[PDB]
Scaffold this active site. Structure first.
Site, short mmCIF file in Angstrom:
data_model
loop_
_atom_site.label_atom_id
_atom_site.label_comp_id
_atom_site.label_asym_id
_atom_site.label_seq_id
_atom_site.Cartn_x
_atom_site.Cartn_y
_atom_site.Cartn_z
N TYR A 7 0.85 -1.20 0.00
CA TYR A 7 0.00 0.00 0.00
C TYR A 7 0.88 1.25 0.00
CZ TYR A 7 -5.09 -0.30 0.04
OH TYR A 7 -6.39 -0.42 -0.37
N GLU A 15 -0.28 4.76 -0.95
CA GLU A 15 -1.14 5.91 -1.28
C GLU A 15 -0.38 7.24 -1.27
OE1 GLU A 15 -4.00 4.66 1.87
OE2 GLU A 15 -5.51 5.36 0.43
N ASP A 47 -6.18 12.43 -26.50
CA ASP A 47 -6.11 11.02 -26.09
C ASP A 47 -5.47 10.22 -27.20
OD1 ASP A 47 -6.55 8.31 -25.38
OD2 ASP A 47 -8.66 8.69 -24.84
N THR A 59 -3.32 5.04 -22.95
CA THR A 59 -3.22 3.72 -22.36
C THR A 59 -1.84 3.20 -22.68
OG1 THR A 59 -4.27 2.66 -24.29
CG2 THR A 59 -5.65 3.30 -22.46
N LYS A 108 -2.13 -0.88 -25.77
CA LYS A 108 -2.45 -1.05 -27.18
C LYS A 108 -1.13 -1.11 -28.00
CE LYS A 108 -6.88 1.25 -26.57
NZ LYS A 108 -6.75 1.59 -25.14
N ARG A 143 -1.96 -3.29 -18.93
CA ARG A 143 -3.19 -2.55 -18.84
C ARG A 143 -3.03 -1.47 -17.75
NH1 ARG A 143 -6.45 -5.49 -22.20
NH2 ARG A 143 -8.08 -3.89 -21.94
C1 8A6 Z 1 -4.75 7.29 3.37
C2 8A6 Z 1 -6.11 6.84 3.84
N1 8A6 Z 1 -7.08 6.41 2.99
N2 8A6 Z 1 -8.29 6.05 3.60
C3 8A6 Z 1 -8.05 6.26 4.90
C4 8A6 Z 1 -6.71 6.76 5.22
C5 8A6 Z 1 -6.26 7.08 6.64
C6 8A6 Z 1 -5.77 8.53 6.74
C7 8A6 Z 1 -6.07 9.54 5.79
C8 8A6 Z 1 -5.61 10.86 5.95
C9 8A6 Z 1 -5.91 11.95 4.98
C10 8A6 Z 1 -5.86 11.74 3.60
C11 8A6 Z 1 -6.15 12.78 2.72
C12 8A6 Z 1 -6.48 14.06 3.20
S1 8A6 Z 1 -6.80 15.29 2.20
O1 8A6 Z 1 -7.87 16.10 2.75
O2 8A6 Z 1 -7.22 14.77 0.94
N3 8A6 Z 1 -5.51 16.24 1.82
C13 8A6 Z 1 -4.41 15.46 1.16
C14 8A6 Z 1 -5.10 17.27 2.85
C15 8A6 Z 1 -3.81 17.05 3.66
C16 8A6 Z 1 -2.55 17.24 3.07
C17 8A6 Z 1 -1.38 17.04 3.82
C18 8A6 Z 1 -1.47 16.67 5.16
C19 8A6 Z 1 -2.72 16.49 5.76
C20 8A6 Z 1 -3.89 16.69 5.01
C21 8A6 Z 1 -6.53 14.27 4.58
C22 8A6 Z 1 -6.25 13.23 5.46
C23 8A6 Z 1 -4.86 11.18 7.07
C24 8A6 Z 1 -4.55 10.21 8.01
C25 8A6 Z 1 -3.76 10.59 9.23
F1 8A6 Z 1 -3.36 9.54 9.90
F2 8A6 Z 1 -2.74 11.37 8.88
F3 8A6 Z 1 -4.61 11.23 10.01
C26 8A6 Z 1 -5.01 8.91 7.85
C27 8A6 Z 1 -5.21 6.03 7.08
C28 8A6 Z 1 -5.68 4.57 7.04
C29 8A6 Z 1 -3.90 6.23 6.34
C30 8A6 Z 1 -7.41 6.92 7.66
C31 8A6 Z 1 -7.20 7.22 8.90
N4 8A6 Z 1 -7.01 7.49 10.02
C32 8A6 Z 1 -8.63 6.44 7.30
N5 8A6 Z 1 -9.66 6.28 8.16
O3 8A6 Z 1 -8.94 6.06 5.92
C1 PLG Z 2 -13.31 0.42 3.76
C2 PLG Z 2 -12.48 0.65 2.51
N1 PLG Z 2 -13.04 0.74 1.28
C3 PLG Z 2 -12.34 0.96 0.14
C4 PLG Z 2 -10.94 1.10 0.12
C5 PLG Z 2 -10.24 1.36 -1.22
O1 PLG Z 2 -9.38 0.35 -1.74
P1 PLG Z 2 -8.32 0.72 -2.95
O2 PLG Z 2 -7.14 1.19 -2.17
O3 PLG Z 2 -8.10 -0.61 -3.59
O4 PLG Z 2 -8.94 1.82 -3.82
C6 PLG Z 2 -10.22 1.03 1.41
C7 PLG Z 2 -8.71 1.19 1.49
N2 PLG Z 2 -8.15 1.66 2.73
C8 PLG Z 2 -6.71 1.78 2.83
C9 PLG Z 2 -6.19 1.21 4.12
O5 PLG Z 2 -6.99 0.78 4.97
O6 PLG Z 2 -4.97 1.14 4.31
C10 PLG Z 2 -11.01 0.80 2.63
O7 PLG Z 2 -10.41 0.73 3.84
C1 PLG Z 3 -8.96 6.57 -27.36
C2 PLG Z 3 -9.22 5.68 -26.16
N1 PLG Z 3 -9.16 6.17 -24.90
C3 PLG Z 3 -9.40 5.41 -23.80
C4 PLG Z 3 -9.69 4.04 -23.88
C5 PLG Z 3 -9.96 3.26 -22.61
O1 PLG Z 3 -8.99 2.28 -22.23
P1 PLG Z 3 -9.47 1.22 -21.07
O2 PLG Z 3 -10.14 0.20 -21.93
O3 PLG Z 3 -8.14 0.74 -20.55
O4 PLG Z 3 -10.38 1.91 -20.09
C6 PLG Z 3 -9.79 3.39 -25.20
C7 PLG Z 3 -10.14 1.93 -25.37
N2 PLG Z 3 -10.74 1.55 -26.61
C8 PLG Z 3 -11.09 0.16 -26.83
C9 PLG Z 3 -10.76 -0.32 -28.24
O5 PLG Z 3 -10.32 0.48 -29.07
O6 PLG Z 3 -10.89 -1.52 -28.52
C10 PLG Z 3 -9.53 4.26 -26.37
O7 PLG Z 3 -9.61 3.73 -27.60
#
Ligand code: 8A6
Ligand code: PLG
Ligand code: PLG
Ligand code: 8A6
Ligand code: CL
Lengths: 442, 442
Positions: free
Chosen positions: A54, A56, A208, A234, A237, A243
């Site tokens: 992970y 992010e 694109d 992409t 292709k 992908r």
């Molecule tokens: C990265 C992420 N994705 N989903 C998650 C998490 C974490 C999370 C997200 C964030 C987070 C992610 C994005 C934003 S933001 O508003 O989009 N933006 C980037 C502002 C910013 C910039 C720099 C510094 C701070 C804020 C704000 C906060 C922060 C934490 C932290 F621990 F720092 F508080 C944690 C965690 C699992 C890493 C989590 C918590 N706690 C839970 N509940 O859900």
């Molecule tokens: C409840 C929940 N739903 C959706 C996602 C999204 O998954 P993708 O990262 O594959 O987009 C997360 C990821 N949470 C990140 C973490 O717990 O570390 C999650 O905790």
């Molecule tokens: C111009 C263009 N932009 C974006 C995409 C999207 O790619 P993903 O399938 O990875 O989402 C395609 C796919 N076109 C399908 C085809 O020509 O057969 C495309 O032709």
């Protein structure tokens, strides 16, 4: 506390279907314009343990730690990407996190215009993508027509982009983004004129280039990077990667765009990146820059030109009467068959191609063409002289299709009934399998 | 016309970094709650040539042909998915195309409510995901707070979901979707009471079970499938699959939902599915249904309880004072250190964990906790008795962190300066590397 035994032993049922899939690819003339074959190095990356991580965020501004080797991978991918498309990292940035082409486009549009923002793209029927604002009277079919307000420009009766109409629309509609670069467009694009229209209206220029990426990279077609604010592509292709997708943004023309695009990818739309994808993209983007790959891309164009010519020589019509790139769209009206019917026939003989609308099709309920492309068969070692055989096979299939339609009728239900057990198709299938089956296969 | 030289030869630079990444994983006590380690079979699938195939649409309803073996794979994946979560295919359907968790959720939300639709989810700071409507007063951070109108409910001062607040808010806000299932929530969820609130307002019930999916599947925790309209889950966390996601939808409760979700995924949001992913998921969902994987999942819970208990025995406080699942959130206020600081220290000793907010945090700039979980280390063969050692390492890191803060100050710039060369961290890193390195590794 896990199972370490191989795929063949752990899950025999799945492994059989996969080995069949592999047999079918090996024994097919693949003319799907958007398809290719990955090498074993790209695929080693895709099966690498780097996808356990992970990571992010972005390099050096990561939420979690342990990301030093991931940060080097993502940075080696961005660098190799900007280099491959001959752009300076001082003028251009790139995001390597979009999971696919459709995601990449939706994220990039959002960054530029936001929700309710106005966009302009080529209509699906004329060769644009779904993600270029596509809708129907019946529905907002793509999120790009629902989350954004979209208007669609059509090609003319000859299949070419009509720049006078794009201007007519752009001046009256006042979009903030105009999209060019297409899914089934057999000619090169005039980006300078798109840029000229975008300036008149104060709109962004979005190219694109997913279908023509290798041509842009290798300097064989027009360079959108000289004129665009944003270029997406992409990686799977003609580029012959995994992908995945790339968003390029012009820093010089729009400072503060780097922040908009990055934040649109995460956290606006995505969460964790897929680092196996990023690794795989790094691996292929290195191959792209080599002189060997330029030779491949050149070979793609040469095959495409020869295939067009061989088809014309057999009295088959092509939209725009030829091609400047890797793809051809065949106009089937003179034989009075649908692309839908020819796809079915071509399936029966292990020839993969897709039905495609032509300018005279009002609806897309039944397209009157098929789209063919050469990158996949060029990767398998086919040369200019092999294109006559491919044309021969396509002409024999068009003829069988005509025969079957006479015997069974014009309704697709009925037509398909003729397909199983036709002696000519079994003969032709056999010929395809022998030639296809012996070609190099990565 | 391709290069089939292996990765080591074809690209030595990339291969060096990957093998380093591999070594770091092998030498790390990995407590990131959302991480795991894929087996070799899952990774063979991800590297399979099936990702060469463009297969837009759904089985038996594809746009292109040659999709017979892809159709079997996608159908086997859906079947294995419904079975794993003990739901009848007559009553539940599943979409297996979402590229990841965040995509799955934005797609599912859109299908139910549409653009400008009203949604309710747990605030990020209280343990919800970004995709559950997360915004700031400053910015609409997630697309889920911009393409939708979102409202966020908080946990109480003890870290628990306050259902009285959810009702207060649901009755006045009148959302069409209420989201439950969380990213850093250490307790089980009362889905029946969510369903009661949802009925009371006419809203849909959306359960995101990405973090607890295996517990739901193995019948160790509450079953959201008895009460939800939609269940989403990633396949890569406790489930131990590839990076992908699943949308489940209740047909019986909502006829017509199947079309909405399927069309939301494609063509609204996505294009071609990633068939290497779908294959990989098939492969893991078979492992999920076996009793051996139930033993794994039970072992995850047993380790998590022992880890919580060992931390309490060392006078460390936990949010909610314990755990019902795979994760713990440590409250660090009594030591007067931030989670941000402890993450840095833990990094220095090859202990991966992440900083996490606690209820008393307001700003979210500097959170006062860290989140830990046991799936990864349980996959590597750690048992209950091994959690004392993990707890002892974490208590030592907390103490070293406390010592470094006194010497170098409370500013993060300054704190870090103490980290390299500290003899205790080098001694502790050494101990970790030795214990971690020797553990089984898929
Ligand atoms: C990265 C992420 N994705 N989903 C998650 C998490 C974490 C999370 C997200 C964030 C987070 C992610 C994005 C934003 S933001 O508003 O989009 N933006 C980037 C502002 C910013 C910039 C720099 C510094 C701070 C804020 C704000 C906060 C922060 C934490 C932290 F621990 F720092 F508080 C944690 C965690 C699992 C890493 C989590 C918590 N706690 C839970 N509940 O859900
Ligand atoms: C409840 C929940 N739903 C959706 C996602 C999204 O998954 P993708 O990262 O594959 O987009 C997360 C990821 N949470 C990140 C973490 O717990 O570390 C999650 O905790
Ligand atoms: C111009 C263009 N932009 C974006 C995409 C999207 O790619 P993903 O399938 O990875 O989402 C395609 C796919 N076109 C399908 C085809 O020509 O057969 C495309 O032709
Ligand atoms: C699949 C796809 N993706 N992007 C592409 C293409 C193709 C394409 C899309 C479509 C298409 C895709 C989606 C819709 S739809 O409005 O979303 N809807 C699902 C209609 C529907 C309802 C019930 C049963 C079937 C279909 C409408 C049309 C159709 C064709 C066809 F040849 F059939 F006319 C072709 C093509 C490359 C396959 C292409 C063309 N021509 C170009 N320009 O771009
Ligand atoms: Cl992948």
């Amino acid at each position: 506390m896990f199972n370490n035994e191989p795929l063949e032993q752990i899950d025999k049922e799945l492994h059989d279907i996969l080995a069949d899939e592999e047999k079918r690819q090996r024994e097919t003339i693949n003319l799907i314009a958007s398809e290719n074959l990955t090498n074993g190095a790209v695929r080693e990356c895709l099966g690498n343990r780097v996808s356990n991580k992970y990571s992010e965020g972005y390099p050096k501004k990561r939420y979690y730690g342990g990301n030093d080797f991931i940060d080097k991978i993502e940075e080696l991918c961005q660098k190799r990407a900007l280099e491959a498309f001959n752009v300076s990292d001082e003028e251009w940035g790139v995001n390597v996190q979009p999971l696919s082409g459709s995601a990449a486009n939706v994220q990039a549009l959002y960054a530029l215009v936001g929700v309710k923002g106005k966009i302009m793209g080529m209509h699906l029927c004329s060769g644009g993508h779904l993600t270029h604002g596509f809708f129907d009277e019946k529905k907002k079919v793509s999120i790009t027509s629902d989350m954004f307000e979209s208007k669609l420009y059509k090609c003319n009766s000859q299949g070419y982009v009509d720049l006078d109409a794009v201007r007519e629309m752009a001046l009256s509609f006042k979009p903030k983004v105009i999209i060019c670069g297409y899914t089934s467009y057999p000619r090169d694009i005039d980006y300078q004129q798109f840029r000229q229209i975008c300036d008149e209206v104060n709109a962004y220029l979005f190219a694109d280039i997913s279908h023509i990426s290798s041509f842009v990279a290798c300097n064989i077609l027009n360079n959108p990077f000289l004129h665009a604010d944003v270029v997406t592509t992409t990686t799977h292709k003609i580029l012959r990667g995994p992908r995945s997708a790339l968003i390029f943004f012009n820093k010089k023309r729009n400072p503060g765009i780097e922040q908009k695009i990055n934040s649109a990818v995460f956290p606006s739309f995505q969460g964790g990146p897929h680092n196996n994808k990023i690794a795989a993209v790094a691996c292929q983007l290195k191959e792209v820059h080599s002189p060997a790959f330029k030779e491949y891309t050149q070979q793609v164009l040469l095959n495409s030109k020869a295939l067009a010519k061989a088809l014309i020589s057999k009295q088959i019509d092509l939209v725009t009467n030829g091609t400047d790139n890797h793809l051809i769209v065949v106009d089937l009206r003179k034989f009075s068959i649908t692309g839908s019917k020819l796809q079915e026939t071509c399936n029966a003989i292990n020839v993969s191609l897709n039905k495609n609308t032509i300018p005279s099709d009002v609806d897309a309920v039944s397209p009157s063409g098929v789209r063919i492309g050469t990158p996949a068969m060029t990767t398998r070692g086919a040369k200019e002289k092999d294109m006559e055989f491919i044309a021969d096979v396509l002409a024999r299939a068009i003829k069988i299709t005509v025969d079957l339609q006479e015997q069974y009728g014009k309704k697709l239900v009925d037509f398909k009934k003729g397909l199983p057990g036709n002696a000519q198709l079994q003969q032709l299938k056999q010929e395809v399998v022998t030639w296809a089956g012996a070609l190099p296969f990565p």
